[PDB]
Amino acid sequence: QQVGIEALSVYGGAAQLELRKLAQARQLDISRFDNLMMKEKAVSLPYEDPVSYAVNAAKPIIDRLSDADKQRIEMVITCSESGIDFGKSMSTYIQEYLGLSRNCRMFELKQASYSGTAGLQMAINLILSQTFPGAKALVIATDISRFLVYDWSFAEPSSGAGAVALLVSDTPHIFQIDVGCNGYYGYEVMDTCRPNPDSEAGDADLSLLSYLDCCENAYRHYQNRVEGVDYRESFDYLSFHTPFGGMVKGAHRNMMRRLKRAKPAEIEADFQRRVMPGLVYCQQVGNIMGATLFLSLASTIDNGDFSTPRRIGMFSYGSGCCSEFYSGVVTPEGAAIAAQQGISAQLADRYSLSMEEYEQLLYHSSAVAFGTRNVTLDYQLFPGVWKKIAGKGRLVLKAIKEFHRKYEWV
Amino acid sequence: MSKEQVLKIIKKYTREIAPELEDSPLEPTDSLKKLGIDSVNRAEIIMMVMEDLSLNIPRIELAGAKNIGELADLFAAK
Ligand SMILES: *P(=O)(O)OCC(C)(C)[C@@H](O)C(=O)NCCC(=O)NCCSC(C)=O
């Protein structure tokens, strides 16, 4: 039974902040964030939210589908830790603006950055159940970091915005899943959390240690289920949830040292070959939470070598915590399809914020705080940003009226 | 093994991770952050000390110390 990702599409925001500018503004050495492998973070405008990010991520997928295939989408799962209601899923808005069938299960899934993987596994199981032959699922991981001006200060350099949309089916043109090859591990821990709206709290040091424990244990569980698997030999590439690149390098190093007793230069060559390709796009958006592992997958595919089919190992983590290691295969044909999406070009055309604009954006973000009943957005908040959006067929948040969010194609 | 013995092992791997501290004095009240070792290297030090002591327990059990003296205490207790 064949199953996996049929189509993958990314939205990396309309604007970004160069972390070297954040460093200069805090009189840090420019090399601090370079040391940690961080370059830019995507930043959500006040007239964007996770729904608009999700729709912009999914629109290219839906645009390419026949009417018949679009109607085969019978589940929409939104995976987020940036929800806009305690009960209403963002999937309802997403269905509305993508024009999907009313015969569709719709819901939202939460477990910090593990949400995307959980959604993907659920979609996989729908296909494998064979309850509805031909049905497809749309899984969209979408997150923003709308912090208002703190508990969240520790995360400011790393907290990005982005969405990745996956179409899941029995014709996996992009990523063919290794069925049953899954290990998972979780336990309650207070490493980071989002206990207040528009905020985040945490002990980053605890979270990094927890990530490392889960990386080891989720993989061991996979290894116990997949006889003969080898951490170097079985995986051509490795993609990870990437809060920032430096910690993924550290995790890979820990794994190689433990499982393969590899020497330091050997580990660094293995890192560059197998892990660095996935970090390329991640370094341009920052931590985009539940979508980050999927962006890492897209990055691995665009930036790695797929002249023969390749197996990618995937490690998902979410604070709180839960984690999963799983795998699949990408063919040369799949890589060629993915390349047509033009992610690198999309990311390069975003507006580069000054530190002054960024601080103003933080200040203006309050207008669309969680719980806002009525707001009308000024699209000319930053005229220069608007010029980079207008005419591109982007969805934006126009207004909230009596809690009802209204979006516009611009 | 003692709190003071462990503390000497923490000092060694700290100096190894951050060579500019080779000669500087290290007090039990010094914090790795203020020294200032980055987030990844703070975890690396913990893991090197764990491996040196053959301590095969969850890494999170070494979290939460505010300075290297408290970290020594945390290890000493395991
Ligand atoms: P250190 O050198 O002190 O720097 C830590 C940095 C990278 C600056 C800080 O921004 C950080 O550690 N961020 C990561 C925290 C985080 O979001 N972890 C991943 C969880 S994703 C999720 C919600 O599951």
Side-chain angles (χ1 to χ4, degrees):
Chain A
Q1 168 76 82
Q2 300 244 114
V3 66
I5 300 164
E6 178 181 324
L8 187 157
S9 180
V10 167
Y11 179 64
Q16 55 91 0
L17 178 69
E18 174 183 45
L19 293 172
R20 287 184 173 186
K21 303 185 195 189
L22 186 63
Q24 282 157 305
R26 302 278 198 275
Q27 296 172 329
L28 271 55
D29 197 26
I30 55 98
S31 81
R32 263 223 79 214
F33 297 130
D34 286 32
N35 264 191
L36 294 167
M37 312 190 72
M38 300 163 72
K39 286 190 160 166
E40 304 152 349
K41 65 162 180 172
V43 178
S44 182
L45 279 290
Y47 48 81
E48 294 184 289
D49 74 5
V51 171
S52 71
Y53 265 68
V55 173
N56 291 321
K59 179 75 172 347
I61 293 176
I62 304 315
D63 283 353
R64 293 189 309 252
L65 297 179
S66 61
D67 293 320
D69 277 341
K70 179 174 176 181
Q71 291 296 307
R72 282 176 184 104
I73 293 169
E74 300 204 350
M75 186 168 63
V76 179
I77 312 187
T78 299
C79 302
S80 185
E81 57 203 278
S82 308
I84 60 170
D85 199 89
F86 278 78
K88 189 187 187 84
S89 66
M90 292 183 286
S91 298
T92 55
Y93 287 114
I94 290 159
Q95 177 218 35
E96 173 67 29
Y97 284 85
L98 292 173
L100 300 179
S101 179
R102 288 192 170 193
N103 299 116
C104 194
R105 300 189 168 121
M106 287 177 282
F107 53 90
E108 192 173 314
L109 192 158
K110 172 174 64 187
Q111 177 27 248
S113 292
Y114 175 65
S115 68
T117 288
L120 174 61
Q121 293 300 329
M122 296 311 97
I124 287 161
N125 293 349
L126 171 67
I127 303 305
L128 295 176
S129 73
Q130 296 190 54
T131 47
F132 301 108
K136 305 177 188 294
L138 179 66
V139 183
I140 311 170
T142 181
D143 274 301
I144 64 167
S145 304
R146 186 108 71 199
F147 300 154
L148 307 181
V149 295
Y150 302 98
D151 287 339
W152 51 261
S153 289
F154 77 102
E156 192 182 4
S158 54
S159 62
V164 177
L166 308 181
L167 183 68
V168 181
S169 81
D170 67 2
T171 64
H173 307 318
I174 306 291
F175 190 64
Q176 302 98 62
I177 287 283
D178 296 320
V179 173
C181 305
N182 303 263
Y184 31 76
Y185 191 79
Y187 49 92
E188 197 276 301
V189 60
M190 290 300 300
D191 57 326
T192 75
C193 59
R194 295 161 194 265
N196 298 284
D198 302 316
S199 195
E200 180 176 2
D203 175 349
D205 289 40
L206 174 55
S207 200
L208 181 35
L209 299 162
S210 185
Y211 181 107
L212 292 165
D213 283 340
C214 286
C215 196
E216 171 183 350
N217 288 291
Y219 180 75
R220 182 180 294 123
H221 192 214
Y222 177 105
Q223 187 191 275
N224 296 349
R225 299 178 147 174
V226 180
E227 198 203 328
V229 69
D230 185 274
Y231 190 69
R232 174 164 49 210
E233 309 305 324
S234 313
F235 308 103
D236 293 294
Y237 298 101
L238 297 163
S239 280
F240 297 80
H241 175 49
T242 303
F244 59 99
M247 65 172 275
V248 172
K249 187 162 176 178
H252 173 258
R253 177 198 306 127
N254 189 230
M255 295 287 280
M256 287 295 287
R257 214 151 45 188
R258 296 196 84 89
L259 295 169
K260 301 294 299 190
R261 306 198 202 169
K263 305 186 191 182
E266 175 174 24
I267 289 176
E268 168 64 16
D270 188 72
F271 175 75
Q272 190 177 269
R273 181 170 63 90
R274 295 207 293 156
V275 184
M276 195 67 213
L279 298 181
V280 172
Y281 297 157
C282 295
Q283 291 184 313
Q284 294 179 69
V285 299
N287 185 358
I288 65 171
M289 276 87 88
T292 314
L293 173 60
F294 301 156
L295 185 58
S296 177
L297 175 61
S299 192
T300 294
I301 296 172
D302 283 358
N303 295 293
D305 189 290
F306 295 80
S307 48
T308 181
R310 305 288 190 193
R311 177 162 278 108
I312 310 177
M314 305 275 277
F315 177 67
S316 177
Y317 179 82
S319 294
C321 76
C322 200
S323 74
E324 185 157 349
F325 188 96
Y326 59 110
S327 60
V329 173
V330 177
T331 65
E333 291 74 20
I337 293 161
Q340 296 307 110
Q341 304 322 289
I343 295 158
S344 195
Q346 184 206 140
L347 293 179
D349 196 40
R350 299 170 300 168
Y351 191 86
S352 182
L353 298 161
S354 68
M355 200 60 199
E356 186 174 39
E357 284 165 326
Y358 171 75
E359 292 171 319
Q360 294 165 212
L361 192 154
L362 297 190
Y363 173 75
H364 293 303
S365 292
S366 278
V368 291
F370 188 87
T372 298
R373 189 200 259 273
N374 291 292
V375 68
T376 302
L377 281 303
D378 179 6
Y379 295 155
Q380 302 302 130
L381 170 62
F382 304 110
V385 175
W386 192 250
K387 210 181 181 189
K388 286 281 207 184
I389 294 167
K392 287 167 193 180
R394 295 262 191 98
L395 197 79
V396 293
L397 173 67
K398 183 197 215 302
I400 307 173
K401 180 192 295 189
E402 296 294 289
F403 306 116
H404 190 209
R405 301 204 172 203
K406 329 278 179 155
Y407 300 85
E408 185 178 1
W409 297 102
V410 298
Chain B
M1 223 185 98
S2 175
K3 178 209 182 323
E4 286 78 15
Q5 296 167 260
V6 170
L7 186 57
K8 288 183 168 168
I9 295 170
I10 293 166
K11 283 183 196 183
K12 180 207 297 191
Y13 289 116
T14 301
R15 289 184 171 116
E16 183 176 315
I17 279 306
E20 69 260 74
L21 298 168
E22 281 298 332
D23 299 315
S24 280
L26 296 169
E27 309 301 326
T29 52
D30 287 339
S31 99
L32 297 176
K33 207 148 62 189
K34 289 307 203 175
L35 276 159
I37 307 300
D38 79 23
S39 304
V40 173
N41 287 333
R42 295 196 300 271
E44 289 289 322
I45 290 163
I46 288 174
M47 288 189 290
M48 291 160 102
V49 175
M50 285 178 75
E51 179 180 352
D52 195 64
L53 302 175
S54 296
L55 196 63
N56 225 280
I57 64 177
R59 297 164 188 79
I60 63 167
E61 295 187 14
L62 290 315
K66 268 154 36 82
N67 55 54
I68 60 171
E70 287 180 5
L71 182 56
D73 291 341
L74 228 41
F75 273 108
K78 292 145 197 304

